[PDB]
Design an enzyme around this catalytic site. Structure first.
Site, PDB file in Angstrom:
ATOM      1  CG  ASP A 262       8.567  21.092 -27.203  1.00 42.03           C
ATOM      2  OD1 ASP A 262       7.820  20.102 -27.166  1.00 42.03           O
ATOM      3  OD2 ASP A 262       9.637  21.060 -27.861  1.00 42.03           O
ATOM      4  CD  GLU A 295       7.283  17.409 -24.090  1.00 35.90           C
ATOM      5  OE1 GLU A 295       7.171  16.247 -24.543  1.00 35.90           O
ATOM      6  OE2 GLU A 295       8.072  18.246 -24.579  1.00 35.90           O
TER       7      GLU A 295
END
Ligand SMILES: OC[C@H]1O[C@H](O[C@H]2O[C@H](CO)[C@@H](O)[C@H](O)[C@H]2O)[C@H](O)[C@@H](O)[C@@H]1O
Ligand SMILES: OC[C@H]1O[C@H](O[C@H]2O[C@H](CO)[C@@H](O)[C@H](O)[C@H]2O)[C@H](O)[C@@H](O)[C@@H]1O
Ligand SMILES: OC[C@H]1O[C@@H](O)[C@H](O)[C@@H](O)[C@@H]1O
Ligand SMILES: OC[C@H]1O[C@H](O)[C@H](O)[C@@H](O)[C@@H]1O
Ligand SMILES: [Mg+2]
EC number: 3.2.1.141
Length: 580
Positions: A262, A295
């Site tokens: 993330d 990401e």
């Protein structure tokens, strides 16, 4: 000659000893003057080894309950492998050696073979557990996806949440199931020939349940901040090893095939070897075929070519697609025109922003880098994911947004699932699910009230803290059996079968992919030694015959799949066809 920094002998936390000798407890503290472990209610002083390392071996086994006592304060173990009473409670000793894996003939999955299916354990089923999720694996296999992408499992506070408030990174969130229930889920997926990937959050800890500073303030830095607290200090080797240790656990101990990192732009590190590079080194040292995805919104190929990650979630495609279908322009959607010509370009380039000015107010800068080094599988594309649904005030899905037809939604699926880039689908997408995916949480006290207040002010907006917001996001499985849901599902099945079976669609080289437009008609052409395919998507409001689309090549004549099942090569508004 890379040597892992991890040795089971010196692992922090509670680790079962060989020969049924019990458990070794270890911790690092820079500030405690007295250090003890409380096991099953009884305190034992720990041995000081130097460098702030403390250790003790006791004849307790897996299942024993413990926490540490620092200057007389009972403190949860940040390295806890399970937290049955939540993030403020005692940890349980876990033995990874006791689970009976049956996946010896599984050898992971290559990125180029992945079609990701993003799952939120709490909403994917009524029960919201791994065991219930495992029962949906045969459906997913038959659907034609090949890799489940699981939203974060690190323990966080409260009885539901997306996972981004994870605080105890090594401990699977107890409401979803016990460690062995998670193992059962992965083992079942592997037996069906599906990969399983985990979303992990190495840029911040959640606001409740993160006790690392109680052990050593130097895990963190005041130099920069995260969303919730002090920034993670990657100059500090114990902080580095906290996350590389964690990555190795998920891959080795839980048999995950890969991790989705993330918000990699917020993993700040000025070290000679960047933490992302060291993560890749550490997971590869495991000697498997595990993948790392980032990401990352910076459009920065160095993630693959320098840090040696496998691929990148690249939202320019998603954004261009949504603006094409809705015309919306709020926030980062202002970065995109949308339309056939814009989509042709974005696909041609992999991502749109390769150094050009990003004019989005409040965010102005020269965004991105040339994409030339990246190959098709390095780009992960989607038209839906948790953020692109959940960060909308009502958490509505693409077909539920004003001015989107189901025909357009189905056209968008055809485009996504025929491109050589690595596709991701969000749970329920495949049947045009009726349910939103809203932002929900369950924090305690003043923190819970602040989240509710925060959400209201940011944009009636559903209260994230209300049980109803969680329940309204639950998949309704029965609805897929009928009507437009069933129609959409049939198309998804057909698309995924074509992706799998079609020898030209097996292409994974950008060299073989070309794109263009005629008015509001997008075309995407693939040419290999196996033949030629063209995807045409009518993004206009009128009907277009394939025969009248101006193309710099002769259109193939054979109709392989029409998104509305039409017999002739004509495209209603929003419809698509694959020809060969
Ligand atoms: O600033 C980060 C990196 O920028 C460049 O790398 C990108 O741009 C190059 C062309 O401008 C590409 O060849 C490369 O694939 C991109 O990642 C620079 O070349 C790097 O050294 C920098 O780290
Ligand atoms: O209709 C006024 C708007 O026209 C354009 O936006 C439309 O056309 C785009 C293709 O050029 C689509 O992607 C978009 O969805 C449509 O809304 C123009 O770009 C807008 O600025 C105008 O407001
Ligand atoms: O896609 C670009 C966008 O990505 C987001 O996640 C960033 O936080 C935002 O600032 C940016 O506008
Ligand atoms: O706190 C004393 C020392 O503890 C550990 O060695 C840390 O890795 C180090 O950075 C620190 O200087
Ligand atoms: Mg024309």
């Amino acid at each position: 000659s890379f040597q892992t920094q991890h040795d089971p002998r010196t692992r922090l936390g509670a680790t079962p000893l060989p020969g049924g000798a019990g458990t070794r407890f270890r911790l690092w503290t820079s500030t405690a003057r007295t250090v003890a472990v409380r096991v099953n209610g009884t305190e034992h002083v720990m041995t000081s080894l130097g460098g702030g390392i403390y250790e003790l071996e006791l004849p307790v086994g897996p299942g024993a309950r413990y926490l540490f006592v620092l200057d007389g304060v009972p403190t949860p173990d940040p390295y806890a492998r399970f937290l049955p009473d939540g993030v403020h409670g005692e940890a349980e000793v876990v033995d990874f050696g006791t689970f009976d894996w049956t996946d010896a003939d599984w050898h992971g999955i290559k990125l180029a073979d992945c079609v990701f299916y993003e799952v939120h354990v709490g909403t994917f089923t009524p029960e919201g557990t791994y065991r219930a999720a495992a029962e949906k694996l045969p459906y997913l296999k038959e659907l034609g996806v090949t890799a489940i992408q699981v939203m974060p499992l690190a323990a966080f506070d409260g009885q539901r949440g997306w996972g981004y408030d994870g605080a105890a990174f090594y401990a699977p969130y107890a409401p979803y199931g016990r460690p062995e229930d998670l193992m059962a889920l992965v083992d079942a997926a592997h037996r069906l020939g599906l990969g399983v990937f985990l979303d992990v959050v190495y840029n911040h800890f959640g606001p409740s349940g993160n006790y690392l500073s109680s052990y050593a303030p130097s895990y963190f830095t005041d130099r920069f901040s995260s969303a919730w607290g002090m920034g993670l200090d990657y100059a500090e080797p114990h902080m580095r090893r906290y996350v590389t240790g964690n990555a190795r656990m998920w891959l080795r101990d839980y048999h995950f095939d890969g991790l989705r990192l993330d918000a990699t732009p917020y993993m700040t590190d000025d070290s000679e070897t960047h933490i992302l590079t060291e993560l890749a080194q550490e997971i590869h040292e495991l000697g498997g075929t595990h993948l790392l995805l980032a990401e990352d919104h910076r459009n920065l190929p160095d993630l693959v070519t320098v840090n040696h990650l496998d691929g990148i979630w690249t939202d320019d495609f998603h954004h261009e697609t949504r603006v094409t279908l809705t015309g919306e322009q709020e926030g980062y959607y202002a970065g995109y025109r949308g339309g056939a010509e814009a989509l042709a370009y974005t696909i041609r380039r992999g991502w749109r922003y390769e150094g050009q000015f990003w004019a989005v107010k409040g965010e102005e800068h020269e965004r991105g880098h040339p994409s030339d080094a990246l190959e098709a599988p390095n780009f992960v594309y989607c038209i839906q994911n948790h953020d692109q649904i959940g960060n909308r005030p009502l958490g509505e899905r693409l077909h539920q947004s004003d001015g989107v037809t189901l025909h357009e939604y189905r056209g968008a699926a055809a485009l996504l699932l025929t491109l050589p880039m690595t596709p991701l689908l969000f749970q329920g997408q495949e049947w045009a699910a009726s349910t939103p995916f809203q932002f929900f949480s369950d924090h305690a006290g003043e923190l819970g009230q602040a989240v509710s207040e925060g959400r209201k002010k940011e944009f009636d907006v559903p209260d994230p803290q209300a049980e109803q917001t969680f329940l309204n996001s639950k998949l309704n499985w029965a609805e897929r059996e009928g009507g437009e849901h069933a129609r959409t599902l049939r198309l998804y099945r057909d698309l995924l079968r074509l992706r799998r079976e079609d020898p030209v669609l097996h292409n994974r080289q950008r060299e073989n992919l070309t794109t263009g437009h005629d008015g509001d008609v997008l075309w995407v052409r693939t040419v290999t030694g196996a033949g030629e395919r063209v995807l045409l998507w009518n993004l206009g409001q009128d009907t277009r015959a394939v025969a009248e689309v101006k193309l710099p090549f002769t259109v193939p004549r054979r109709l392989l799949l029409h998104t509305e099942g039409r017999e002739d090569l004509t495209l209603g508004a929003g419809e698509a066809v694959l020809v060969g």
